[model samples]
Target chain A: SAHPWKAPGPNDSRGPCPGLNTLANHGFLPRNGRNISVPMIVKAGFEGYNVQSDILILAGKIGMLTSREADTISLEDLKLHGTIEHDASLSREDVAIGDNLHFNEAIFTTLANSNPGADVYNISSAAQVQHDRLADSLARNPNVTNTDLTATIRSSESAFFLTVMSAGDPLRGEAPKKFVNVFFREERMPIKEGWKRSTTPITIPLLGPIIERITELSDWKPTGDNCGAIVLSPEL
Target chain B: SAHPWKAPGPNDSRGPCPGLNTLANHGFLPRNGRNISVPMIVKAGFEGYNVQSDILILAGKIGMLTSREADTISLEDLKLHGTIEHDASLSREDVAIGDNLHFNEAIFTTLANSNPGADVYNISSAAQVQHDRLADSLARNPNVTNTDLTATIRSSESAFFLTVMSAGDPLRGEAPKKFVNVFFREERMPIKEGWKRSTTPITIPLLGPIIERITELSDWKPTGDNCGAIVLSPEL
Candidate 1:
């Protein structure tokens, strides 16, 4: 709440995740999106979205593999595809087709266009949008390798947005369109739009049910294949 | 060739099949979209798109089940979902979400946006568009029953457009943007765009390989579920 929103400088590195970008924008994380340590991310997740430390720690550690320094990662390092960044994104085009790291207008429009006759998005609308994104990826990218690891990540991300953007209890499964749009499009916390951090912590335990419900509603069953992540070299 | 292009009257019923609609618009089939017989469809298929009789016959006879005359069908009868009409259409939304019969601009825009840096659509581009459409259907429509029957129908339709609009041999799978746009958007043959009927007949055998290739490129595998098509009543 004490964090002030500031535009990223020219040297600042932004990645595919609006969550981290929003944190960086609000100075919850380093505004420059560089040399971010595990503790910094964990604190940002907790203070910004009430996310549990474990989720942030795992993502931050895995993301650190892309950093030259063993202890920290730049935000641009998160752009390495197939590790945490996977296909069928809600607001980004696939890595195979276009700019996978940037928020694409057409893709976001498709997401906004879902959930007709409502000013808010729920579990059903979230599931529907997720499914559409995946289907598009599957169709367009012949090389789309959406294994269990990637699929789970996508599902978790869907739940993350729904939980973080909810106007009330995350369990209610409804998030205002204004909040969701601001968070995704502007990479800014919807403070002006009456958005607040979750009263409940967005933990693995809290997120598990939400993820399962979104996946169930989307009817996207994860494959049994154990496809490992592609850890990109720090030199790149 | 004798038929001049005329817009459908208000009373004329247009359905999901662009092939039929194109034929009707050009007066190859009746402009009214009513009381069409098997022979008429077969002739239209031969003359307009160079599709062979067997494929036309199978589609026509099955469509007749919704007709009161036992041997004829009105084009509106084809709106019966899941009996040839299926989910994940290229230019239409899924039956569960919105109008599955008419050409939707957003969906078509998505199709056109694929295959960046190309003035023409090829097998790869076609495959990408098809995948995106299906992904959307699977995501939004929780009740989206995309059985093998529906999936095959979608693949075949994709092949149909690519084959009919190709600048050269259908095997090449390159359709000019102008021709493809005119056919889908205007529901008229791309005569001014210099589209000519295939010199070779568009038969099941010819179409099978193209369908298989498109499916292969799109990575859209048909489910093995033995789901039968829904038989709609003539009264409806």
Candidate 2:
């Protein structure tokens, strides 16, 4: 059960290939339990700035996470952690306090029903996936100087981060320029799992105030730029 | 149906008034369009800066812009515009890019529906709405009172910008400080109606990259400090 990664061959031709968006492009709903995406990682350093801030981090359903550690995939934060979003009746654009919370979280997990550390992995997708993260971060940070997370095929680089700001001339007194990285990318959060097994909820926009909110991949910095990280190495 | 404003007397509680969560705590779905609870009309000029970034001039629908102008609330542009977001399986949290996508985006467009425009009014809340605009510039240039509109409000303030970055001394060039207004407020935006009604789709985190993304109220400034722009004086 070491580095086992299979699934994605009904034809393969979309944006985030191999999984119905890859835990909705790089994350696990804050690993479920509590972290409601924690303001898109809330950052201190380590670079992962919302990259374009397409947004959406928790909605629910899907499972895995036992420990036999085959590869990893777990779900069930659904009720958006405490699922309690609200809004009046107004219109046009913006949608996410987890899509107006009402799911009522509880999909099934004794770690994906006693699959235990068996390291389950299945998330695949297609026909739709346009939260196009810098092309999913150059398709999971691939400038590929050599390419060998395990002597070759290791795919799973879904990262996240973004920010930009500018304002000044306070009546010519001036002062305002927040650009953090505006887009700091390493790319490759390419996930797709589906021709048709079907599932959907991918959305975000609890739009700024909790302030903001990714996908994940392990270390791989061939200077494709940075946000990449992969470590199933022992070559698995 | 010129200035039809009705909804909010099931018991009138505290902040996000008239509706269940006020566009879901200030938004639609990325936690109902980001409800960190920031209504930033926050000001500090004399020096603290970031002064009065009010923003949001009209992307569509706050209602009441009907003819000889009735109650004064005109904010239109809602075609459900550019709405699309997706994500998936992997341990370590990130929830499906909003169950694959399909909220329909009407969210309840009818407290009045076909009035089209009367420039309606009535949107107040509570807590802290002080942009303290030096008495609104002592009352608009009481001596250039020190100008600042690049300290702007409809800079779109940009539909409320949300970004936070990090990076330290990478050869000492280091830069990280984008919280601009992290979140500001001017109080009185409390809405809640449902003596028997309802709503849903409440969610957030549509998760990142579409480049940050929520809503608006109208005015304030009983010198609560400024960022308060209340004018319908012909009295709607």
Candidate 3:
């Protein structure tokens, strides 16, 4: 909680996940953002957001494939599509269409405005935004592929952000706009803005209802059943 | 009212618009879907669905470009990417992705199931569906261009379907599931399925409130201010 935040140097690697980026920036993980492993992710996630290690372990295992090393992954390595990163991200563009790592103003603006004249976003409105993002991807990306696992990953992200930043009631999955925007746009904790990490650990089971609520409310289904990856051409 | 609907022959051309396709099928417009002018469109729209001619006239004039003749348009010509067909359509895929002029089951299925336990779709639910579609397109299509006119066209289509097929509730913009499905699936009025045209004319002004309601409820804004078009590669 007392870790001082530092902006990354030019040599440091960063990826699409704002949560991980924030952890790295705050010294929860290595500030260099290199050679990050499953244990590091688990510890960082647990300390920073009180998120359970199950999800982080799963992400780190899958993301390790993008690594040059045997057991560790650079933050940038997670940028590989259909790994930890995929289409229809909340703040980033799809790997098939645009920069999948950076925070996109247009995408985040739409998300920030999702609640319509409100500073707080609930599960339903957030899910609606996610649904719309996927709808656009399905309509326009020729190589777009969404499967059960990717869809869960996408849904879980929405749940994580909402619950991790909520004032108190995480089950309601309500989050303040300021905390959410600051996290995505700056990739830093909004502790100065009065946001505190949830005391309750946000496990996959704890997030299950929120994820299912998002799925049911948004009604956005994947195109297939598995983690189907679309191979991008080198020219693209 | 007595216009007998006929299925489109192999030689008959059809566009993405289910309304115009239905009109052509019912002999209100040319059965072959060729040589349709503003006057013809205005007359057919008014008689068939009690729709005001101002919007049709605008569409017909702009659609005139697809025709070889001076004042007419073939239905197939309306499939031109930016002129009429654009991205993030409710039932049709984008011209940038797959078939743009045909009904997509996956897309339409999402729209039909939008309300989840109900057969009747109100303005809010319908608008939510449109918002999701546009959101998906914005994230996935790199060349996607959405402006005021295209966005309105998209919203108006949602309003038109809701009001035109609605059972005595145009103001509420409510329509039965069966009628909406039959109209899109068969490209004909759901007359035999107990649907009828609105007794009141569906003018642009009459549709204004409904359209605005949709826009307000969905909160989907376009990328720009004008009718921006994205040119597609010939190879694509």
Q: Can you give the DockQ of every candidate in the order shown? A: 0.01, 0.01, 0.01
Give the lDDT of residue B148 in candidate 2: 19
Question: Model 2 residue B169 lDDT?
Answer: 13
At residue B58, candidate 3 shows an lDDT of 45
Q: Which sections of candidate 2 miss by over 4 Å?
A: A1-14, A21-236, B10-236
Q: Give the TM-score of candidate 2.
A: 0.18
Q: Please identify model 1 stretches exceeding 4 Å from their true place.
A: A221-226, B1-236
Model 3 segments more than 4 A misplaced: A224-236, B1-236
Q: For residues B211-234, could you state the per-residue lDDT of candidate 2 as single tens digits?
A: 121112223222222211111111
Question: What DockQ does model 1 achieve?
Answer: 0.01
Residue-wise C-alpha lDDT for candidate 3, range B129-179, written one tens digit per residue: 988888878877777768765777788888989988898667778899889
DockQ score for candidate 3 = 0.01
Best by lDDT: 3
Superior by lDDT: candidate 1 or candidate 2: 1
C-alpha-based local distance difference test score of model 1? 0.77
lDDT of 3 by residue, A42-139 (tens): 89999988987666655554555455443466888778775558888888888788899888998786688899888888888888898888888888
